[PDB]
């Protein structure tokens, strides 16, 4: 634990990036979290929503 101060910075940056990528897998109330699935499954009037 001598070099904890640098390790905290590295861990915080990696954790923030990891959480940012994990947020892509959430649908946020939509039918799916994948854009390609929405483009392939729906017409533009519902796809815009």
């Amino acid at each position: 634990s001598a070099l904890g101060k640098l390790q905290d910075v590295v861990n915080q940056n990696a954790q923030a990036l990891n959480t940012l990528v994990k947020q892509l897998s959430s649908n946020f109330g939509a039918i799916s979290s994948v854009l390609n699935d929405i483009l392939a499954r729906l017409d533009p009037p519902e796809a815009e929503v």
């Binding site: 039918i31 392939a40 499954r41 729906l42 017409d43 519902e46």
Partner: protein, 50 residues
Amino acid sequence: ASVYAWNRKRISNCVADYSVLYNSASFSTFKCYGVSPTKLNDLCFTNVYA
């Protein structure tokens, strides 16, 4: 079958041409909710139930 005893048929291990369903005018209502009617020929599915 009647609505209280509605018949459920499993559809699996087949290639489906949905274009004959869209282009047929015999159906008074042809309304899809979670998928587009014209994209049905381009996707693969499982757990199809009628």
